[PDB]
Design a protein around this ligand. Structure first.
Ligand SMILES: *[C@@H]1O[C@H](CO)[C@@H](O)[C@H](O)[C@H]1NC(C)=O
Ligand SMILES: Nc1ncnc2[nH]cnc12
Length: 246
């Protein structure tokens, strides 16, 4: 298990949590020096539990699939909550079995459905450590519309930060003040599977992507990533989605 406390949190303690989260994900291989997530894991071992504590010390436990860093569900006091999708239903067979009741959220866990449920796109939802404290608090008591927004915050400040050093740094910048994600952040989120695939295909293609990945950069400009010498590959992406899962 990995844990993060908002009470006393700073960029350093958040950095430590994101390190712990990455390190909890198993791999047997690195591709271009980046850990390659496993094709599959059987049984309860598929799921990492993240213990998150709000500023007041209240807690939720979040279930994360270690193959793809996908949040499947969470436990808040004695109630479990899972996304409305087959992978989350499967997860519910292994985690939080001792919850007094299980609620299936009225949406799946992808960004398209969550943004619909929340009534707003990610571009308009501030993220940061304060927003993560809010999100934890929101999830403690069921409210499906409020929970959609909370879950967009939770996913970007945990899973997305684990996947990309740039996103981790963005959240660190937002330790004490929320701000909507940069368009580069949005771009990276949207591109992880694509990038993961191209980095793997580059092995056997002399480091060259079979298909260029289009990203938005820090200055707001749109760029093509064509090979493993890109900063996105050398100094940003931290985990690879196995092509078996693409
Ligand atoms: C690889 O990417 C860099 C930019 O990141 C580019 O300038 C260079 O020409 C590319 N090399 C090849 C072989 O595509
Ligand atoms: N539930 C989820 N967990 C991790 N990353 C995601 N990206 C979109 N939905 C996600």
């Amino acid at each position: 298990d990995v844990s993060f406390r908002l009470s006393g949190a700073d960029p350093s303690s958040y950095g430590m949590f994101i390190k712990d989260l990455r390190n909890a994900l198993p791999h047997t291989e690195k591709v271009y020096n980046i850990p390659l997530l496993l094709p599959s894991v059987s049984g309860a071992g598929r799921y990492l539990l993240m213990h998150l504590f709000n500023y007041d010390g209240n807690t939720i436990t979040v279930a994360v699939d270690v193959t793809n860093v996908y949040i499947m569900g969470y436990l808040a006091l004695t109630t479990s909550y899972f996304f409305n999708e087959p992978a989350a239903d499967l997860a519910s067979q292994y985690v939080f079995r001792s919850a007094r009741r299980k609620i299936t959220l009225p949406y799946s866990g992808n960004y398209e459905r969550l943004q619909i449920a929340a009534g707003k796109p990610r571009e308009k939802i501030p993220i940061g450590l304060p927003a993560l404290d809010t999100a934890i608090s929101t999830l403690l008591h069921y409210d499906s519309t409020a929970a959609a927004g909370a879950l967009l915050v939770l996913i970007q400040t945990t899973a997305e930060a684990a996947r990309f050093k740039y996103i981790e740094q963005q959240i660190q910048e937002r330790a004490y003040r929320d701000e909507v994600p940069s368009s580069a952040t949005i771009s990276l989120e949207n591109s992880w599977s694509g990038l993961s695939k191209q980095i793997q295909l580059a092995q056997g293609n002399n480091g060259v992507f079979r298909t260029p990945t289009v990203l938005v950069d820090s200055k707001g400009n749109r760029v093509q990533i064509t090979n493993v010498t890109s900063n996105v590959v050398t100094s940003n992406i931290q985990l690879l989605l196995n092509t078996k899962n693409i």
